[PDB]
Design an enzyme around this catalytic site. Sequence first.
Site, PDB file in Angstrom:
ATOM      1  N   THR A  90       3.877  -1.596   2.888  1.00 15.14           N
ATOM      2  CA  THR A  90       2.748  -0.723   2.169  1.00 15.14           C
ATOM      3  C   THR A  90       2.621  -0.944   0.778  1.00 15.14           C
ATOM      4  OG1 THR A  90       3.119   0.748   4.198  1.00 15.14           O
ATOM      5  CG2 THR A  90       2.344   1.735   1.975  1.00 15.14           C
ATOM      6  N   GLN A  91       1.518  -0.749  -0.023  1.00 11.50           N
ATOM      7  CA  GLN A  91       1.161  -0.763  -0.968  1.00 11.50           C
ATOM      8  C   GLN A  91      -0.001  -0.022  -1.350  1.00 11.50           C
ATOM      9  OE1 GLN A  91      -0.462  -2.933   0.864  1.00 11.50           O
ATOM     10  NE2 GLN A  91      -0.595  -4.638  -0.326  1.00 11.50           N
TER      11      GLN A  91
END
Lengths: 226, 250, 233, 233, 204, 222, 196, 196
Positions: free
Chosen positions: D1-2
Amino acid sequence: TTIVGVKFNNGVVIAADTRSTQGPIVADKNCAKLHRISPKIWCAAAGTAADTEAVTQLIGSNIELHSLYTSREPRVVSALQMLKQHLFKYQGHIGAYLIVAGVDPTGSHLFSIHAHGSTDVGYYLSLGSGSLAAMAVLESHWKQDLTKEEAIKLASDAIQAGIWNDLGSGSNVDVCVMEIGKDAEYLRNYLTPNVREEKQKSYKFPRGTTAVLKESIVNICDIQEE
Amino acid sequence: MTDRYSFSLTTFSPSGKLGQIDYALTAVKQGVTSLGIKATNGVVIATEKKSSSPLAMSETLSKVSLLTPDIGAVYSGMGPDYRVLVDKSRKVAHTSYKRIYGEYPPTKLLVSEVAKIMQEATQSGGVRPFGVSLLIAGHDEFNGFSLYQVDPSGSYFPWKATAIGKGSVAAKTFLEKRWNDELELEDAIHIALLTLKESVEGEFNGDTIELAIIGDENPDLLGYTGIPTDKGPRFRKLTSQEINDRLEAL
Amino acid sequence: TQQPIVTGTSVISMKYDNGVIIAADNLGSYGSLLRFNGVERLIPVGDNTVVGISGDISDMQHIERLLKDLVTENAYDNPLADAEEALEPSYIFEYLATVMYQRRSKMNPLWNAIIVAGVQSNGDQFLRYVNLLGVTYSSPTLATGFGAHMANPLLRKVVDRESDIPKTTVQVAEEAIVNAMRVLYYRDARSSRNFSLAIIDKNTGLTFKKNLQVENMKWDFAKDIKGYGTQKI
Amino acid sequence: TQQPIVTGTSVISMKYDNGVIIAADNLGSYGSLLRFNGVERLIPVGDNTVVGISGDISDMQHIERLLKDLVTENAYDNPLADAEEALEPSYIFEYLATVMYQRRSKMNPLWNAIIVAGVQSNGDQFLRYVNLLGVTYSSPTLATGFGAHMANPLLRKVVDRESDIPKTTVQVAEEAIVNAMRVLYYRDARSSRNFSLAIIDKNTGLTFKKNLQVENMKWDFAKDIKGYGTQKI
Amino acid sequence: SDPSSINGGIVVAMTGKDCVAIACDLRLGSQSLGVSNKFEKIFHYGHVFLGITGLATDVTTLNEMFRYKTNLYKLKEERAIEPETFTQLVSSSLYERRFGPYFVGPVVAGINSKSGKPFIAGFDLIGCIDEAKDFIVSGTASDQLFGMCESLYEPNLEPEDLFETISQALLNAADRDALSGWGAVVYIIKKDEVVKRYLKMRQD
Amino acid sequence: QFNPYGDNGGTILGIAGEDFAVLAGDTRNITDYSINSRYEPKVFDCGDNIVMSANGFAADGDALVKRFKNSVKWYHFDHNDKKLSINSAARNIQHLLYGKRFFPYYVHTIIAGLDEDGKGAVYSFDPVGSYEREQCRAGGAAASLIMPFLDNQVNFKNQYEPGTNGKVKKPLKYLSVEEVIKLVRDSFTSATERHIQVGDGLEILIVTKDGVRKEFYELKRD
Amino acid sequence: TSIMAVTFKDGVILGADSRTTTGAYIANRVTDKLTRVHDKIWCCRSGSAADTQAIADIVQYHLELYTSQYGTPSTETAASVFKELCYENKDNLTAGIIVAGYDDKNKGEVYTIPLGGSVHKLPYAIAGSGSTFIYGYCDKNFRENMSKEETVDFIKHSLSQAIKWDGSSGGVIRMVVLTAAGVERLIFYPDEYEQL
Amino acid sequence: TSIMAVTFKDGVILGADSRTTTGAYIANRVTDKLTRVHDKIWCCRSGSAADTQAIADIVQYHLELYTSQYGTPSTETAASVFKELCYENKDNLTAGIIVAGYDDKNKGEVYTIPLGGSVHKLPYAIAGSGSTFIYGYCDKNFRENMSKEETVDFIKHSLSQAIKWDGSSGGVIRMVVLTAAGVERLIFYPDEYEQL
Ligand SMILES: *C[C@@](C)(O)[C@](*)(O)[C@H](CC(C)C)NC(=O)[C@H](Cc1ccccc1)NC(=O)[C@H](CC(C)C)NC(=O)[C@H](CCc1ccccc1)NC(=O)CN1CCOCC1
Ligand SMILES: *C[C@@](C)(O)[C@](*)(O)[C@H](CC(C)C)NC(=O)[C@H](Cc1ccccc1)NC(=O)[C@H](CC(C)C)NC(=O)[C@H](CCc1ccccc1)NC(=O)CN1CCOCC1
Ligand SMILES: *C[C@@](C)(O)[C@](*)(O)[C@H](CC(C)C)NC(=O)[C@H](Cc1ccccc1)NC(=O)[C@H](CC(C)C)NC(=O)[C@H](CCc1ccccc1)NC(=O)CN1CCOCC1
Ligand SMILES: [Mg+2]
Ligand SMILES: [Mg+2]
Ligand SMILES: [Mg+2]
């Protein structure tokens, strides 16, 4: 905590207060915050007390082995590099904030290092809760080409500012002077401006004041012969 | 690109001998003479600096090594094997002792750790034993002064005085006559220089001899002042000049 | 409940033998943006009082209007408005302290820290602090924000206790204040070089100094600092 | 996740009788800041395929390197690398679609929306979409981001179904694409005037057009707009 | 929820003239419920004494751990561990659990058998050492103990006087804490004799 | 979010004698790790031979003292200059505190004086107005350090007669004013050593039939 | 932080302010944010002090090892090594780095690497909190193929304005000049650049 | 939004972009953000479109009623009425307003009212999201007592840059000139100002 470092003509001086705390309580009134990494590399510690001790001892151990391996006296930049890479890896979780100073064959050095692994270079530095009070004194009285005597004076004055004005700091001033071509001189309790006054009363009790249920001898010796 | 040697290279022969250990002891016999003598107020360890070439700087090759501030070591046999053992001995003094107890190990326990490393090279997969015998001299608060020998098997023994390597049989006899329990450290250094002269062929001086002591605390060698309890290293390597002074009164 | 928007940083002050000194820089910050460079944060009330304000500038301007209106109101039906019934520092302070605590008690504070500096009728020095919570205190030196952490240590070296006040001249006290303002410019990220300073003396009255600058700065040693450890050039 | 940092906006495309057209503007936005004005977001693969990418630019540059490496790898031990065993649009797409879905399934997506436009060996038009979730679909017109909402309605007036494709010439199709890019410049706050356009035709091959500008803009009526209701001047 | 105050309890140690004293309460509880009135918190390994406050499972675990380690120490070293050395061992052992610590407040007390010097030390849960000349406190009534010790204590007290001082410091501190009390034990330690005394205190 | 409360530190101590009472407080005022003042008076003469201190959040403390002082003024006006007794003062303070039950004054309050029989009296209040008369009370940051010492030295708790096994308690006595001030000074010297928020100065107000007297002593400034 | 790198006729110049902040406290007022990764490849650092130091130390190591095996690395190569570290560790890093270098073949080059780990080759680059305030100024005043004196003035005037408006920037203006002639360090104090 | 007001020799000039945004969609590309509160007192609006319209409508009402009773209000008075609404309703408003006007006595005046509801009298003022990018440019290029043509160019160049870098600003540049001569409306299209 208040810790400082000050460069001078032929070396570097570090200093620290002697208070350690647990919440708002003073756990130790004569704490020693000047840690020896190697004979001529010393550092002042602020932050989580266990972490500063553990980190100085680990890098001090590995510096000693590096010195024996290379047949050379340890360098301050090596202590700095090994400290920062260790602290960076642990992403700030090891709460060690340190002022690292010393003399080596390259000359005299003064650095600071923070818990996340960043380092900085300077002629004068301060760290800990009392660092603002100390930096105020340093910014007001520091000059280029200080003598040994002037640098000790300035460093201790900067700690005193922390002692008197920061509730995190107190008690005594510890100093260590590292001069080129000389043994490092650790001055434990260099100033003692906070001795407790005599109490009004003695609280020594009469013998027999406390009520006892049972007495017994405790065997501390090993299993006996015969 | 595999280490497939997971089996022992040292095994028992029909006669009960461990061949590789015996052969390692033979390599130690070929090595240059080294000795150790224990006094009442100190210990001395000594050996010949056998220079491989006169162009070589024999000062750079240190046969006598500091392990801790109060413990020193010398050897006979294969020099490279000794060098890596000194590296491991210094490290294990920290990892298995100083980082736990906040103080340097006593002589006997550091010896025990070195002995363990040498035993493992006598049983583990795909390795040969170390081709050295060590003499470890040291001091600690509760045991006092001590001198230990360590062999390729991992076995170790405490000595009042001994010798290992080339002329050890002759050197041990010489020490039996001269040693007594009332010796001062200077007397032990004098006896060490006399014993070592017999096994040396060529030049005999401070530049061809390597000698160190475990003696009094040296606060001048510490490098700092301000801690009363830290009084300095008991290990001291004698200089080239200091050896030559004692050779005139010989 | 709100949040401060346009803000002013430290106000610093101290007592000396014959009066009081107070100072504050001329900046109105908008977060990290140094938005407004000509903001006066020392506001005189009569010829005997200066109110130094930090924190929210919109709330400062409100307080400024309250004080201006207070002077107007005091003059009403008062033949001694410029004499025995003139506004005192102690009256001006207590008024502000009442307002501050009332506003915090309605959960709608004036987001400020305030130092009232002045000289009373009888020649006595007045110096007292009040903030958004209604907390009040007096001391020979007083400072808000970063000034509490950095200016007070320096000013307390001159006046450490009450008995040091008569021993401190106006020249020594002003010197200490000017140095403290330099230290704050080195070290406070929301400060400016330009500042105002006010002296309220029992003999010479109110002296208000505008457009002062931090001078005699040391930056030369910066040329010798390279890298962060191992870099040599 | 970013989270996406430097970003590219709409990519738009359509089929016409003999091939496909694709277009995208030359901007790399940093939130509301229009940071980088010379970013190419159409990346050709061989002489038969153009991959148009929107979303995170760091991830776009990674994908660009994957495609560059894919051409190198296809050439290895392949005497027909520039003929019967050359990379096809369908091969390039399926590779990207596999990577996109694998990355979302490890909860570490490539934060992009991708349109692969090209012409196959047999002359068939290829146009297919894939995004950060691994979702894929094909249609006579395709567009990402704001283009989905604004360009598709316009492009669907030209090609509303499959049977309209043979009736649409390259001039009509390009005109529709150029107009759609103007509409996006009027209405998308993270767009730019400068753009790139690529035509992949079965007869005339790959035509790549750089440094195009939106032109024939209508702003004149703006002079007559005053106030927001009652203001007359 | 806070592991350091589920079970409750206290330990205090003091130095005197050629002697040390270490003392503890006897309570173990589950928050408000008192469970045991015989839960001693002071242990000994040869002549070195260790008090431990905090989470009771960790008190028991660490006693068993330091018994283990000091037994092996003695076999290898051929002598009993000293207070100074044991202090370092406690610190090392706590810090190796830096990011999953034992929820405890240990206190070392004893006389060095060679130098004859009285020794006390305290630690936080991750192993930082406080080596005090005067006194060391630990547990849920640590604030209370700090206050009692700081006023009642004077240096160079004889063993039988030091007993009165440490007992009164413990008792009065415990009575101001809900989670401490339920009995108390005091060890008076001299170079070659150790006396253990159970104190009569209020049982609420 | 705006937080209407703060912590100004400080510590206070009331002790009741036979014909006198003392109320002592340190003169240090703090926020976080900063010192605001080394001498900010915290114990106040409120008239009618009553001394008061409301330690904790200083703004609420000042507000409460100010309201009580005013309550004394209006008690004189409304009841023909009658002296407000210490018991009556205490009940009035309960109503002042409980009036803000759902937005409390963040303070620990102690009052001291003489009761209507001339005997020393100390009353103690929680933030929302529960009260009790006691021989002893400490309040504020270092209360946990000081109170156990007072239990031991003023009320002779856990102390027994030597040689009685443990069955005759040390009998209760009133302390002299000289003996009380010694205990007050040692309490604050001890608290200053171990609590960071305690220091700078000690101000003691002593109440007798003759009136209210003050004594000041230096404390450590670190 | 306010940082920039500007290509010009004879090479490239890097510039930076000297301020390090902890909250609103200035932890270091004489910081050196211009760091050497190779003889004539340098970088400007912004973002976390710890992160950018760690990255720069790793890049210096990689380029030293590159030099031992393959000779002098290009500026593009140095930028690629920075990128690889910033991109692959994007979740755990806060680093905004400008890479600047001088080859004899390629002359002056500037590469900017923002938070995502993308790379952008540019004639000049600006970055850090204070850069927002000078986009307008820099776009209007930048020309290609400027002289050394013109480029020093362009950076001095630009960072002067960045410092003036950004509270997170301040102190001295440090610069590093990269040409065929060598490596020159320049410093400019407040009394000089504030009055511009 | 990018907005500014600039005093000059003959009076004052207000300037603005024409963009209104809902998220990243441009709801209106030809917005008029320059609004009349009195014959020769105007304002530039930024922040919420609803809030600034509501405020401006109330201010226009207050000044119309002021005029009926007391004659022409000063620019300072108009700014005070804006302030009162912005300050007292600070919790419920998102409005950044620049007030600009021409008297014959006071000539050109500019007052800026940011989010808190503070007032600041200035020679010129800039505001809105796009203003951040032109602080540097405006500080370096502003002079007092400029001509009409110089001040039109200063605003045109400034807002051109604000538009170029801010995605939240765009469209046409609208201006309103306030002098003794009267009220002049100016418009400048993309093809003109982009090539500057
Ligand atoms: C005092 C100073 C001015 O801050 C200065 O920096 C000194 C410098 C040291 C002595 C080198 N710092 C301290 O004294 C620290 C301050 C600090 C406290 C808490 C967190 C970080 C810093 N004091 C200590 O570290 C303290 C030493 C003891 C008193 C010997 N240890 C604790 O307070 C300990 C820290 C635990 C901890 C765990 C994980 C991450 C960080 C810290 N906390 C407790 O003992 C609290 N509690 C634990 C359960 O039992 C009851 C007590
Ligand atoms: C000044 C500038 C415009 O920011 C410029 O970019 C410089 C460039 C450096 C010198 C190369 N950057 C800084 O000064 C950073 C700004 C920053 C802060 C926090 C996160 C990212 C960037 N300052 C530091 O890195 C600072 C250096 C110390 C003082 C030596 N470190 C911190 O402030 C530390 C960072 C923790 C962190 C790291 C990475 C991501 C997120 C957070 N933060 C603290 O110590 C927080 N501080 C808050 C107030 O109470 C004390 C603790
Ligand atoms: C463009 C600019 C730089 O922001 C400039 O300031 C202009 C100036 C105006 C024209 C005077 N401002 C706008 O365009 C605002 C920007 C803004 C948005 C949100 C809050 C404050 C300012 N745009 C609007 O006011 C917009 C006008 C409509 C489209 C006619 N209104 C909204 O976007 C509306 C505001 C709700 C709101 C109001 C006040 C405080 C907080 C929020 N928001 C939405 O409809 C949200 N939208 C999000 C995406 O899904 C649809 C719903
Ligand atoms: Mg109890
Ligand atoms: Mg202090
Ligand atoms: Mg735009």
